[PDB]
């Protein structure tokens, strides 16, 4: 992962209602994510959970 985009959030030093940990903690957790790329261009994923 290179860069994220959180809807309704303007930067990383803040929180979002409904979650138990702020943006920094989720960024740290996402750092552990492992993915393999087959295409040589920036691709985009989605993560929608309510």
């Amino acid at each position: 992962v290179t860069s994220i985009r959180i809807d309704g959030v303007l930067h990383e030093f803040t929180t979002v209602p409904g979650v138990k940990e702020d943006v920094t903690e989720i960024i740290l957790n996402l750092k552990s994510l492992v993915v393999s790329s087959e295409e040589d261009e920036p691709v985009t994923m989605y993560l929608r959970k309510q």
């Binding site: 930067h11 030093f13 803040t14 138990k20 940990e21 920094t24």
Partner: protein, 1112 residues
């Protein structure tokens, strides 16, 4: 034995049990204020302590004042019973809204007129009071404040003794130091002239003043018959007579005045019996009574010196001169006779915040009552009302200025909770009302055998203020008078007593104190017939196991709070221990904290009492939790909510956050931590991380305290911190007009202001680079104008018809990061602002810093260092199983500094991390006899704690290192000694010899590199001195000391010095020409005449001194 409900479980190398839990670490700070204001809890505590008279602070101060009256005796005023009210607004809003946490106080004043016989009583407002929050801090104007205690010499009597170098005879000097009044010095000299020095006068014989009171000569003879030298003085004095004596005393005191009996008679009582003019604190009166054993059976009420005290003092002095050991006075029990010491804690009292605030309000009350009495004397006597009398300005102004400018009002350093706690517990010795640095003797900075149990001898600032700033002991509690105490359990007949009592310095000296570490049988029987003991002063000697009277409580009874959490403190050196203790107060809160693997058991307790961690009040069940707030349901059906501040700038620039560590649907018991603040992990302090260390010189990159770090730390945010800056701009009115913040700004490209919003401020979440504009504003221009005629003209016409300059605020030199939030205060919205201001706006910039080169690191044993180089993860040495190390330490610095404790700490950390299992099938090994039965079986990443002065011994470590659990690969890495085989990352071949490895706790200091680095080539120049500005923020050049001039002269370098002094500091045309020549290819022109020389000329020509040049 975890007192708190849900603290993490960490078995300890416990061998002895402490019979009492550590008292409230902040009780000392809050008790003073509680006594001062007066609350039911304080009254109950005082009644429990046994004090007969429960008296508050405000009531005492404003009752000793009343009843005021006029000299004519026809009018009087009284007012008592002070009471307080509720709060204005919560603490959060007060801190955020810039208000001040306070509360109003009302005093019921009764207005009585003598000649008439009327009473006018009603409540009166007396301003606000800066109440103290539950964390022992003062919130003033939104900025945290904390007042530090002070050390003062208790007012009393001190018997000094100086040996004559020629006479070689003892000269016993007694000096009385009351709170306010005259000073009496009775000294026996070689000439035998036993005299007095009232207000630094000539030594007049004591007998003269003794007779001045009318003391019968026969009573002098009989009461001093035992004294020979004083009898000789009596036979030697010439002037005799009560009238003659008093007149001579008056002439000596006040010569050139009408000598009359009435004058001296009134002056005597005025200077020694008028309480207002001559007063002593109740502590002083009690201490003097105890010293002389006079007036012991009654509670002191009158706080004035008495004649019997003086006669007893002179009798004591003469008896001491005779060489007697103990002296007795009628009505006084037997007491010893000996000289006093200044550096004894039986004389140096402690004045908490209560005393300081009481004195300040006393001064305010005196100022108010002077004007009140003058007004009542002068104002009409018929329709006068107390409301019209009392003036509230002086007291409020006094308290405000005390909180503002008094040196005892310091910003509470908030790098981490430990620093705040230490600051709250600090014991200052300098400042107003105390000695200065130059006048203070060097001896006071040394330890005293009476410091054991009261003030820690280790913790102390490294700077010149060494010995003047101590810290309370763990178990120390201030007595209601101000003499520090220390718990003790009294041995009655050689059997320890579980019940404990508190003893002061004087009582401690008069008894026998045992040693806590001395073995004691489970039944309370002393196994050893001979037990070491501490005696009167600096004396220790074995004594039979029967006469011993007192025994300490715990081995940790003399260490400070900061020093109490340094493992293996019994192995380091005094200087190293002090350095480590001071370093522990400079950590920086990280992003992901981890509790230490090895640390004393005083971590969680020091965190709960720190106040930076919330805790449930009643045992309830949590319904739901959120990252921003929590809601716990009480068992009584009352819902409560706690709000946790997230990413709020700390008082010192660091960040502070709170992350709840509770789950939804858990019945949380009362007293259980609910959220972890900065430097915390599961409700316990964590100022650093755990790194795998190696001890070996590596290619000189760790040369002379340097340090090497693996890139794994950098790329994993192991030591990444967050720092939040703060800037603010204001638009204040001016005679030429009022400035207004506006998006538009003259002659600026659209790109530059592309970040500002419509209102004229940068949008939140926009990256800012150094030199960028942060907020725009316009400054009007100056044009001469008519005050009222053009004011009428400009109101109706000429709108925006003159010019405006640009004075927008920009990011300083060397700052960057995100914009997290913007706070704007407007006078339109009815927001309190400083006078003469309309719009003050502050912007917070938060930057995430990753540990880099030039950063300080240091363990808990005081071993500083710098990051010499950060090698790639592929280059660091790795264990036989492929586990690269994270940091390498030099070895030559360990034995010279003599801090071997860190080696044991590393060994124990490795042992705990790897987990151990001591063999027990054949039985407990002899070396494992004293190990706790539950400490023989550990798990990977286990937690262990070694209390100071009582921890695992060398044999324990030897045994543990031989039973560590094997790696998952089936092999054990380290040997019994603790060393291991490595593999070079560069050469790829193993080192010829093994090396030591293990996990050691590492903190992070506040001396970052980004603050230090700075450059300056060309920039703004000062207008008054024509020199470049100074400081990194102002983008100014560096200073050039005179020692540099001396060095340049030494080399014989001339043109370089010429340039440094002329062409780069002062000469304007020189700077312009040299800059242009460098821009082009032309040679640098020779410098000119420095501005300093020309200024000196044009200034010296002003004193009529024709200073020619003589160019010829």
């Amino acid at each position: 034995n975890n007192s708190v409900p849900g603290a993490p479980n960490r078995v300890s190398f416990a061998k002895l049990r402490e019979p009492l839990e550590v008292p409230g670490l902040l009780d000392v700070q809050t008790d003073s204020f509680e006594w001062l204001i007066g609350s039911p809890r304080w009254r109950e505590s005082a009644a429990e302590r046994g004090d007969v008279n429960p008296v508050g602070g405000l009531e005492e101060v404003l009752y000793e004042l009343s009843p005021i009256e006029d000299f004519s005796g026809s009018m009087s005023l009284s007012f008592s019973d002070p009471r307080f009210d509720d709060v204005k607004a919560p603490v959060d809003e007060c801190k955020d809204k810039d208000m001040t946490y306070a509360a109003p106080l009302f005093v019921t004043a009764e207005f009585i007129n003598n000649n008439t016989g009327e009473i006018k009583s009603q409540t009166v407002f007396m301003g606000d009071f800066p109440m103290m929050t539950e964390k022992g801090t003062f919130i003033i104007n939104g900025t945290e404040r904390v007042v530090v205690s002070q050390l003062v010499r208790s007012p009393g009597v001190y018997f000094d003794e100086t040996i004559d170098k020629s006479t070689d005879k003892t000269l016993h000097s007694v000096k009385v130091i009351p709170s306010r009044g005259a000073w009496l010095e009775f000294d026996v000299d070689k000439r035998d002239t036993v005299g007095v020095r009232i207000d630094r006068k000539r030594r007049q014989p004591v007998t003269v003043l003794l007779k001045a009171l009318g003391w019968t000569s026969e009573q002098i003879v009989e009461r001093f018959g035992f004294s020979e030298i004083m009898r000789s003085t009596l036979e030697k004095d010439n002037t005799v007579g009560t009238d003659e004596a008093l007149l001579d005393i008056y002439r000596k005191l006040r010569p050139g005045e009408p000598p009359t009996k009435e004058s001296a008679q009134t002056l005597l009582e005025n200077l020694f019996f008028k309480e207002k003019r001559y007063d002593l604190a109740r502590v002083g009166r009690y201490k003097v009574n105890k010293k002389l054993g006079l007036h012991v059976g009654e509670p002191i009420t009158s706080s004035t010196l008495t004649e019997e005290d003086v006669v007893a003092t002179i009798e004591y002095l003469v008896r001491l001169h005779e060489g007697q050991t103990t002296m007795t006075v009628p009505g006084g029990v037997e007491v010893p006779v000996e000289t006093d010491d200044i550096d004894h804690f039986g004389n140096r009292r402690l004045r908490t915040v209560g005393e300081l605030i009481q004195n300040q309000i006393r001064v305010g009350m005196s100022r108010m009552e002077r004007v009140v009495r003058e007004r009542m004397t002068t104002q009409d006597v018929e329709a006068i009302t107390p409301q019209t009398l009392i003036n509230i300005r002086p007291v409020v102004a006094a308290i405000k200025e005390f909180f503002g400018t008094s040196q005892l009002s310091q910003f509470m350093d908030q790098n981490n909770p430990l620093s705040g706690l230490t600051h709250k517990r600090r014991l200052s010795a300098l400042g107003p009302g105390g000695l200065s640095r130059e006048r203070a003797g060097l001896e006071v900075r040394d330890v005293h055998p009476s410091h054991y149990g009261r003030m820690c001898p280790i913790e102390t600032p490294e700077g010149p203020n060494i010995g003047l700033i101590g810290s309370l002991s763990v178990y120390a509690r201030v007595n209601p008078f101000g003499f520090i105490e220390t718990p003790y359990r009294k041995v009655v007949d050689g059997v320890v007593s579980d019940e404990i009592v508190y003893l002061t310095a004087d009582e401690e000296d008069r008894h026998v104190v045992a040693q806590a570490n001395s073995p004691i049988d489970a039944d309370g029987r002393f196994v050893e017939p001979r037990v070491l003991v501490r005696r009167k002063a600096g004396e220790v000697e074995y004594v039979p196991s029967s006469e011993v009277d007192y025994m300490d409580v715990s081995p940790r009874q003399m260490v400070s709070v900061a020093t109490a959490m340094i493992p293996f403190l019994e192995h380091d050196d005094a200087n190293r221990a002090l350095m480590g203790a001071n370093m522990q107060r400079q950590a920086v809160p990280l992003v992901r904290s981890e509790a230490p693997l090895v640390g004393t058991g005083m971590e969680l307790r020091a965190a709960i009492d720190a106040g930076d961690v919330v805790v449930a009040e009643e045992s309830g069940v949590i319904e739901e939790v959120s990252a921003d707030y929590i809601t716990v349901m009480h068992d009584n059906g009352t819902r409560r909510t706690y709000r946790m501040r997230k990413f709020a700038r700390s008082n010192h620039g660091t960040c502070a956050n709170q992350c709840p560590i509770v789950d939804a649907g858990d019945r949380v018991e009362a007293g259980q931590v609910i959220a972890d603040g900065p430097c915390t992990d599961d409700g316990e302090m964590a100022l650093g991380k755990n790194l795998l260390v190696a001890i070996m010189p590596w290619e000189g990159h760790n040369y002379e305290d340097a340090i090497i770090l693996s890139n794994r730390l950098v790329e994993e945010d192991v030591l990444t911190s967050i720092h939040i800056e703060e800037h603010e701009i204001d638009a204040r009115d001016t005679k030429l007009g009022a400035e207004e913040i506006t998006r538009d700004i003259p002659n600026i490209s659209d790109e530059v202001l592309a970040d500002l919003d419509e209102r004229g401020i940068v949008r939140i979440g926009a990256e800012v680079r150094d030199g960028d504009i942060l907020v725009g504003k316009v400054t009007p221009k100056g044009e001469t104008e008519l005050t009222p005629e053009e004011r009428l003209l400009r109101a109706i016409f000429g709108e925006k018809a003159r010019e405006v300059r640009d004075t927008s605020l920009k990011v300083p030199h060397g700052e960057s990061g995100k914009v997290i939030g913007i706070r704007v205060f407007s006078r339109e919205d009815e927001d309190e602002l400083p006078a003469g201001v309309n719009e003050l706006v502050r912007v917070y910039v938060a930057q995430k810093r990753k540990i880099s080169d030039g950063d300080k690191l240091a363990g808990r044993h005081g071993n500083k260092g710098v990051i010499g180089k950060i090698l790639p993860v592929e280059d660091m040495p790795f264990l036989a199983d492929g586990t690269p190390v994270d940091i390498i330490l030099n070895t030559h610095g360990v034995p010279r500094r003599m801090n071997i404790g860190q080696i044991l700490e590393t060994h124990l950390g490795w042992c705990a991390h790897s987990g151990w299992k001591v063999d027990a099938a054949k039985g407990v090994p002899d070396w494992a006899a004293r190990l706790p039965d539950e400490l023989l079986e550990a798990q990977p990443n286990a937690i262990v704690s070694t209390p100071v002065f009582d921890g695992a011994q060398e044999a324990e470590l030897q045994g543990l290192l031989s039973c560590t659990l094997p790696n998952r690969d089936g092999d054990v890495l380290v040997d019994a000694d603790g060393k291991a085989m490595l593999f070079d990352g560069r050469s790829g071949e193993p080192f010829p010899y093994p090396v030591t490895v293990g996990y050691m706790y590492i903190m992070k200091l506040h001396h970052l590199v980004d603050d230090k680095i700075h450059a300056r080539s060309t920039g703004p120049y000062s207008m008054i001195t024509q020199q470049p500005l100074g400081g990194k923020a102002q983008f100014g050049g560096q200073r050039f000391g005179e020692m540099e001039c001396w060095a340049m002269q030494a080399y014989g370098a001339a043109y370089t010095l010429q340039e440094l002094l002329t062409i780069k500091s002062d000469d304007t045309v020189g700077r312009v020409k040299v800059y242009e020549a460098i821009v082009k290819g032309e040679n640098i022109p020779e410098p000119g005449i420095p501005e300093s020389f020309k200024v000196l000329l044009k200034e010296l020509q002003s004193l009529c001194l024709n200073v020619e040049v003589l160019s010829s």
